[PDB]
Amino acid sequence: STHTLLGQFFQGWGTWVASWPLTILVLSVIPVVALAAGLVFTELTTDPVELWSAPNSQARSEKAFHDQHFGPFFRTNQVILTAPNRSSYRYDSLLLGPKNFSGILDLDLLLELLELQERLRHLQVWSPEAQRNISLQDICYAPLNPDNTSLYDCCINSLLQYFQNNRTLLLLTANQTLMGQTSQVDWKDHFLYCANAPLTFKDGTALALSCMADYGAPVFPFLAIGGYKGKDYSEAEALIMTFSLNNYPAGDPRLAQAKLWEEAFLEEMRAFQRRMAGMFQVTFMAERSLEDEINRTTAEDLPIFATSYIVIFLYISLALGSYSSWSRVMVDSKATLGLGGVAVVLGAVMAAMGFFSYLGIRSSLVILQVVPFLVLSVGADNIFIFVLEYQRLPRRPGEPREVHIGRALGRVAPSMLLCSLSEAICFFLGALTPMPAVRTFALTSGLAVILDFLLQMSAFVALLSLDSKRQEASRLDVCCCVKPQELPPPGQGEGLLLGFFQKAYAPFLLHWITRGVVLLLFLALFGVSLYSMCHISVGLDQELALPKDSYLLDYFLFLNRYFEVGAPVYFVTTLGYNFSSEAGMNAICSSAGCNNFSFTQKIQYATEFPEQSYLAIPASSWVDDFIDWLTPSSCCRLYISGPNKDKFCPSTVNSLNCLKNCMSITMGSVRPSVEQFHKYLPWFLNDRPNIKCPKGGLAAYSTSVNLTSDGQVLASRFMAYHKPLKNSQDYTEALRAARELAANITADLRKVPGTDPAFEVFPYTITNVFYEQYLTILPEGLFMLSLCLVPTFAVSCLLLGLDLRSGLLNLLSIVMILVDTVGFMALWGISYNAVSLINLVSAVGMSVEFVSHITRSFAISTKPTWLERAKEATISMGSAVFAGVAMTNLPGILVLGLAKAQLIQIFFFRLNLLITLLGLLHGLVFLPVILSYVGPDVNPALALEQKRAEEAVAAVM
């Protein structure tokens, strides 16, 4: 047997370590200090939200292709106003009749918003390293003037961009006589005209105001107002103000300038929120806000979390003392054992984190917030079980205490090796997740558990050999430097936990009426959890990642309640498509003699059913606008002759020298040639729209087409908009629907004669990297749990020498614990994600402590009947399991309920509490009752004695 060999080795090792305690203490404490000294050398914490993306996923490669060919997506800063206390009012329009206007659409509130926007556009920030003051124009996203950017070329979207941010145009007034009705046209008529026709250069009213933004692009009504249903724009309940900035890679120095300006913007918006208390109800969001809202509560929650170490120091040496009398309460306190155990757990956690800081592995908030208080839950169990088995084992006559300590260690050492080995294997198998923040946490927890077992095989055995040598002396517990007293002798009264209660609790549990009741209650609980696991929700809401006292939660409430569209989505066409042949242009069209089921018509028909697809606004095509930009009327022109014979006549040139159209006439469905396409495409892409040529140019498609030196098209993107997505299920369904529509597009686009294979069209959204995991998280989680359940059962049958019946009977208990945990997690509204998956994977290994000790104690009992063996196994090991395994993880788990971040308080406190209570209930109430009915038969258990006697005679030389 390979169990008695491990027991004999641990007996000899325990005798040697007890013989050389000071040497083993110094040679085990110096390497731990050497490993833990590197918490400064390369100790860095990864703060952004790129810890929540798999770097090799398909979405990450699509983002890499998009950022390579078009530049990164811009940073967004948003404000939502929604003045709630004002009443709506009736307005008699001249071109539309009677209408209801909201209370927020008033001139005074618009003037206050114009003041806030003008003050926020002129904000300047000092970059700290002796540089210049950073203005908005250095960092703003200018869509149609990126090189020589000005302060009025920045993309700022709001309602006031309909009036070009001009306070005089907002107060403009003129009366119009329409059907003999002189009526006072004002700003409301112009806003009603621009809400329906955003690309307009002359208003159709008495006041002939323009409608374009001051930087030159049209502003759509869903980017400027919210809270309306349909096309009743005047009843909008919210105003939206957006500042868009350029995005750069993480090493770039301009990202620091953008983040400094975003911090100044956030301080200015907090001042505006305090100033307008009885007027608006402002909520705001900067692009940097989520990262420093996630990484904010760590330092203010670590010292509150550190009181569990003091509580676990208190619980040891009060549950391990000997209260035989008041004359010797101080001498048997065992406080040195609790202090050594807390030092062992702290040293193991610090050594694991220091070793990972040696290799340059970045830390995160989850590691610093739950690793020292999750390792502490499972680290003191083996220490408490070893000390309790040492106390319960009587000493033979004429036996030294070193041999006694080795003999006590040799009985419980393989089971406490099995528990730590199963926990380490479960953590390392759970470290196969794609998420880096979960992978580093799993690796740190597994290394901490391995170092904890290696520390408690040597340093705790040396400390227990040391403090038990002052106990035969009359030295006091922690004040052992002096004061040895008379000390009347102790008695073997069996204690209170082992003696009194378990020999008055075991009669209750193993009654004939308690056993059947426990069986048909646990089976019904298993069936109810099996039914209730199917109502579980897959995903992780972003609002759960924030603290409760966060300003981002009010923003997410207003965004989910008032926005009419979601984030923009780009359908990107990669390398391979021609775009220059007529057959390639007909497969992209939407009008004028093109194909019946094209790209854009497919997207538009997808937008007609916004519950099946998740698109609300149809895609804008550069191909269609290029086709009807080339339609000849005052739009593309060529010079007749001169110094420039045929160069280009833009629309801002008045002369008789520009009379020839770029294209010709008399052909229906005007398609340019290959030469005309390659010659005329950059002029369309650089053309600025105006009153006599509003048709298109660099406002929308200057950055949506990548060209080469020859003038061919490498890649393209077509922009549409999602519907409002409120939860992670909406994000995952929108990603799946967009990918299915892109595959349907690609299968049709590949049929065009000339398009090479491997051309594809894919959807790109800024949030795609965070929600691609949930398409395939369920079978990967089932595969990880099935892979974790194998080696625990494999190593529980060679280490402990268990029979197949004993090996199956606790595998059943672990499966019931997992099923009941998933059922209660469905009941409590705990979603299924990577964090809860790693918690369940750790719970597979933590639950072997509840069952393996009791099963091994039942298997090695030479009692006559089955009920007597179950009673002896309960009284022997269920008391130790309750006092150690069930009680050490209560403080570390219960201190995480004061977490102040919702992720720690939901996925680590509630789930670990459910796993602990279900494991205790399945270990101490179900396992003895199921063992009393069906269990292993009696086995020869004298092999342990006849192999222990050889080591006990080998311990003297």
Ligand X SMILES: CCCCCCCCCCCCCCCCCC(=O)OC[C@H](COP(=O)(O)OC[C@H](N)C(=O)O)OC(=O)CCCCCCCCCCCCCCCCC
Ligand Y SMILES: *[C@@H]1O[C@H](CO)[C@@H](O)[C@H](O)[C@H]1NC(C)=O
Ligand Z SMILES: CC(C)CCC[C@@H](C)[C@H]1CC[C@H]2[C@@H]3CC=C4C[C@@H](O)CC[C@]4(C)[C@H]3CC[C@]12C
Ligand U SMILES: CCCCCCCCCCCCO[C@@H]1O[C@H](CO)[C@@H](O[C@H]2O[C@H](CO)[C@@H](O)[C@H](O)[C@H]2O)[C@H](O)[C@H]1O
Ligand V SMILES: *[C@@H]1O[C@H](CO)[C@@H](O[C@@H]2O[C@H](CO)[C@@H](O)[C@H](O)[C@H]2NC(C)=O)[C@H](O)[C@H]1NC(C)=O
Ligand W SMILES: *[C@@H]1O[C@H](CO)[C@@H](O[C@@H]2O[C@H](CO)[C@@H](O)[C@H](O[C@@H]3O[C@H](CO)[C@@H](O)[C@H](O)[C@H]3NC(C)=O)[C@H]2NC(C)=O)[C@H](O)[C@H]1NC(C)=O
Residue 645's contacts (CB-CB under 8 Å, 6 or more residues apart) are 639
Cβ neighbour number for residue 875 with a 10 Å cutoff = 18
Q: Which string of x and - marks every residue 48-77 that binds ligand U (by CB under 6 A)?
A: -x--x-----------------------x-
559 binds ligand U (CB under 6 A): yes
- Of 125-133, 245-253, 496-504, 594-602, the window that binds ligand X (rule: CB under 6 A) is 496-504
The alpha carbon of residue 397 and the mean position of all alpha carbons in its chain are separated, in whole angstroms, by 60
Site for ligand Y in 90-149 (CB under 6 A): 98-100, 124, 132-133, 148
297 binds ligand Z (CB under 6 A): no
Query: Nearer Cβ to ligand U, position 269 or 437?
Result: 437
50 binds ligand Z (CB under 6 A): no
> SS3 breakdown of the chain: % helix, strand, coil, rounded to 5?
55, 10, 40
Site for ligand Y in 148-207 (CB under 6 A): 148, 173-175, 182
Query: Nearer Cβ to ligand Z, position 109 or 343?
Result: 343
Please, what is the minimum distance in Å from the beta carbon of residue 89 to ligand W? Answer: 48
Query: Nearer Cβ to ligand Z, position 450 or 777?
Result: 450
Residue with tokens 């077509």: 718
Query: Nearer Cβ to ligand W, position 31 or 71?
Result: 71
Please, what is the minimum distance in Å from the beta carbon of residue 214 to ligand V? Answer: 8
- Of 81-89, 374-382, 489-497, 687-695, the window that binds ligand X (rule: CB under 6 A) is 489-497
Identify residue 555 by its one-letter amino acid code.
Y
- Of 166-174, 180-188, 711-719, 901-909, the window that binds ligand V (rule: CB under 6 A) is 166-174
890 binds ligand Z (CB under 6 A): no
Cβ neighbour number for residue 554 with a 10 Å cutoff = 15
Tell me which of ligand X, ligand V, ligand U, none is bound by residue 366, counting a contact when its beta carbon lies within the kind-specific cut-off of 5 to 8 angstroms.
Answer: ligand U
Cβ neighbour number for residue 780 with a 10 Å cutoff = 15
| Assigned token pair, 536 | 């579980």
Tell me which of ligand U, ligand X, ligand W, none is bound by residue 269, counting a contact when its beta carbon lies within the kind-specific cut-off of 5 to 8 angstroms.
Answer: none
Query: Nearer Cβ to ligand V, position 120 or 405?
Result: 120
- DSSP characters over 218-240: ---GGGTEES-SSS-GGG--EEE
Q: What does the alpha-carbon distance between residue 685 and residue 702 come to, in Å, rounded to a whole number? A: 5
CA distances (Å), origin 224, targets 161, 221, 284, 614, 742: 9, 5, 15, 21, 29
Tell me which of ligand U, ligand Z, ligand Y, none is bound by residue 766, counting a contact when its beta carbon lies within the kind-specific cut-off of 5 to 8 angstroms.
Answer: ligand U
Please, what is the minimum distance in Å from the beta carbon of residue 528 to ligand X? Answer: 16
Tell me which of ligand U, ligand W, ligand X, none is bound by residue 882, counting a contact when its beta carbon lies within the kind-specific cut-off of 5 to 8 angstroms.
Answer: ligand X
169 binds ligand V (CB under 6 A): yes
Q: What does the alpha-carbon distance between residue 545 and residue 904 come to, in Å, rounded to a whole number? A: 9
Tell me which of ligand W, ligand V, ligand X, none is bound by residue 706, counting a contact when its beta carbon lies within the kind-specific cut-off of 5 to 8 angstroms.
Answer: ligand W
- Of 80-88, 205-213, 445-453, 797-805, the window that binds ligand Z (rule: CB under 6 A) is 445-453
Site for ligand W in 50-109 (CB under 6 A): 68-71
Q: Are 313 and 907 in contact (CB under 8 A)?
A: no
Site for ligand Z in 311-330 (CB under 6 A): 318-319, 323
Query: Nearer Cβ to ligand X, position 224 or 518?
Result: 518
Phi, psi torsion values for 560, nearest 5 degrees: -70, -25
496 binds ligand X (CB under 6 A): yes
Query: Nearer Cβ to ligand W, position 714 or 944?
Result: 714
Query: Nearer Cβ to ligand U, position 419 or 769?
Result: 769
Q: What does the alpha-carbon distance between residue 437 and residue 429 come to, in Å, rounded to a whole number? A: 15
Q: For the chain, count helices (H), then strands (E).
A: 35, 18
Residue with tokens 């006697």: 949
Query: Nearer Cβ to ligand X, position 377 or 768?
Result: 377
Q: What does the alpha-carbon distance between residue 344 and residue 339 come to, in Å, rounded to a whole number? A: 9
Interface residue with ligand W among 290, 714, 797, 815 (CB under 6 A) is 714
Identify residue 513 by its one-letter amino acid code.
I
Torsion sign across C-alpha atoms 394, 398, 399, 401: positive
Phi, psi torsion values for 247, nearest 5 degrees: -110, 140
Q: What is the CA radius of gyration of the chain?
A: 37
Instruction: Measure the N-to-C terminal CA separation of the chain; round to a whole number of Å.
Output: 27
Q: Are 815 and 789 in contact (CB under 8 A)?
A: yes
Residue with tokens 């495409």: 681
Identify residue 665 by its one-letter amino acid code.
I
Residue 530's contacts (CB-CB under 8 Å, 6 or more residues apart) are 819, 823
391 binds ligand V (CB under 6 A): no
- Of 235-243, 452-460, 534-542, 545-553, the window that binds ligand Z (rule: CB under 6 A) is 452-460
* Residue 453 host element (H or E): helix 436-467
Query: Nearer Cβ to ligand Z, position 113 or 816?
Result: 816
Please, what is the minimum distance in Å from the beta carbon of residue 127 to ligand Z? Answer: 22
Q: Are 538 and 831 in contact (CB under 8 A)?
A: yes
Interface residue with ligand X among 93, 127, 242, 391 (CB under 6 A) is 391
Q: Are 293 and 174 in contact (CB under 8 A)?
A: no
Query: Nearer Cβ to ligand X, position 306 or 521?
Result: 521
Classify strands 568-573 and 713-722 as parallel, antiparallel or unpaired.
Answer: antiparallel
Q: What does the alpha-carbon distance between residue 638 and residue 585 come to, in Å, rounded to a whole number? A: 24
Site for ligand Y in 708-747 (CB under 6 A): 737, 740-741, 744
Site for ligand W in 679-708 (CB under 6 A): 706
Q: What does the alpha-carbon distance between residue 627 and residue 582 come to, in Å, rounded to a whole number? A: 11
Residue 500's contacts (CB-CB under 8 Å, 6 or more residues apart) are 494
314 binds ligand X (CB under 6 A): no
Picking from 373, 391, 771, 756, the residue whose alpha carbon sits closest to that of residue 567 is 771
Q: What does the alpha-carbon distance between residue 789 and residue 792 come to, in Å, rounded to a whole number? A: 6
27 binds ligand Z (CB under 6 A): yes
Number of residues binding to ligand U, judged by CB under 6 A: 17
| Assigned token pair, 160 | 């006031």
Q: Which string of x and - marks every residue 852-891 that binds ligand X (by CB under 6 A)?
A: ------------------------------xx---x--x-
Contacts 24+ apart (CB under 8 A), 180-186: 181/94, 183/92, 183/94, 185/94
Interface residue with ligand Z among 170, 353, 698, 854 (CB under 6 A) is 353
Q: Which residues pair with 242 in a beta bridge?
A: 78, 157
Interface residue with ligand Z among 228, 824, 882, 907 (CB under 6 A) is 824
- Of 161-169, 335-343, 774-782, 928-936, the window that binds ligand V (rule: CB under 6 A) is 161-169
Residues that bind ligand X (CB under 6 A): 319, 322-323, 388, 391, 495-498, 501, 505, 882-883, 887, 890, 924-925
Residues that bind ligand W (CB under 6 A): 68-71, 706, 714
Residues that bind ligand Y (CB under 6 A): 84-85, 98-100, 124, 132-133, 148, 173-175, 182, 278, 281, 596, 737, 740-741, 744
Residues that bind ligand U (CB under 6 A): 49, 52, 76, 78, 285, 290, 294, 366, 437, 542, 545, 559, 567-568, 766-767, 770
Residues that bind ligand Z (CB under 6 A): 6, 9, 27-28, 31-32, 39, 43, 45, 302, 306, 309, 318-319, 323, 346, 350-351, 353, 368, 372, 420-421, 424, 428, 431-432, 439, 450-451, 453-455, 458, 824, 827-828, 914, 917-918, 921
Residues that bind ligand V (CB under 6 A): 166, 168-169
